[PDB]
């Protein structure tokens, strides 16, 4: 199952590419929330996400921005997801075809990325 | 508390040095396991090790290879000692906490060394 | 000898606080220009400056962004110091100096971080 | 152009594979050299290469090994052919993709893969 992420501060933003971007790339359920990303504590929304999510589902958002504002709170997500057997997809870099010439750099690399862009939604806040 | 863990795929090696350098170090208790480690799963007295440990506490090892050589294994254990607030220092590569001055700079390089240091692991077996 | 950079595009920005920074980590001599980021090409006191410093020298500045907004220019900018043997240094980034483990890693990380933050520069000008 | 370039730090390597790596992507003149990549001192042959192409021209080896076995090195070859205008490919890895709208991000993409494959050259090398 393909479950999508939504955030959004405020609905200046546009809410409809990120809506269809998530379901372009084959959201069956997506959880919208307008709520600020500087913490996991107070949205409900991506909680109840997460505890949907198990095992061969694939958890995706148009960009990790949107999944949090915060390094730590993010890179914890990305290995709740990861210890729960939950693909993690980005709808602005998919990343899944192959870069380099071996295996294991790729996932080396794929997970330097996200910790990079994790960084940076902390850094622009 | 500060405790240790040392592993030894053959005892040909030497392994009294290993459990030096913990000593030395600073280990107060130390947990000793003989595996191939090629899966964190089939060591029960690795296991015993990271639930003994709690808050505030250091977890400490030679280098990470001796923790394992998966790169997925080898972050999941890492991330399981951040969740539970427990520094996971390297005899091998001995660096202090706040790596740089920034916080949130300090947060990425902490985990990108794991990462690289764990990408080593299954590079060289 | 210790070169300081400082670079500010309006009169509203704090040019204080930026000398104060420079000064408190060794700053003899600064280059200020008033002058966009957004290139290189007209600011020839940033390009004076880098001429200035030799090798063992200490190039400092406050933060990447004050460096340029433009992510090919920052990286050449970083390169010309390092073939110069001259060391960047960041007010922003306190013990950036310090060597975290072997000096390869370091050397991935620094890089790493300083390539971010030149990419951060320009994504947040255009 | 498509200048290549291939080292061998000895006949025991495949030297005759290495070539026909290098004109299967469309190599028309190939710089051989032959000795270690440790620095670029005892490599006269890369900077005969590195000196005769010029902008608009690609250079292109079979690794990053190839180009030096040194991140402060492989790095600093990596820039000299930024500042020539002289694209750089790697026979090695594939076509990548693309970074659909984020040219900038391409920019750091492609940079970082270099890293990567410069510090795990050296990792391998100890």
Redesign the interface.
Known sequence: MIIGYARVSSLDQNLERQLENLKTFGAEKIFTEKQSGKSIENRPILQKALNFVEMGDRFIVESIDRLGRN??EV??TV?YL??KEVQLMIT??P?M?????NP??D???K???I??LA??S???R
């Open positions: 390094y730590n890179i914890h290995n990861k210890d602005s870099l990343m075809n192959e870069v380099i010439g294991l750099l996932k080396f690399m997970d330097l990325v910790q990079i960084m940076v902390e850094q622009e």
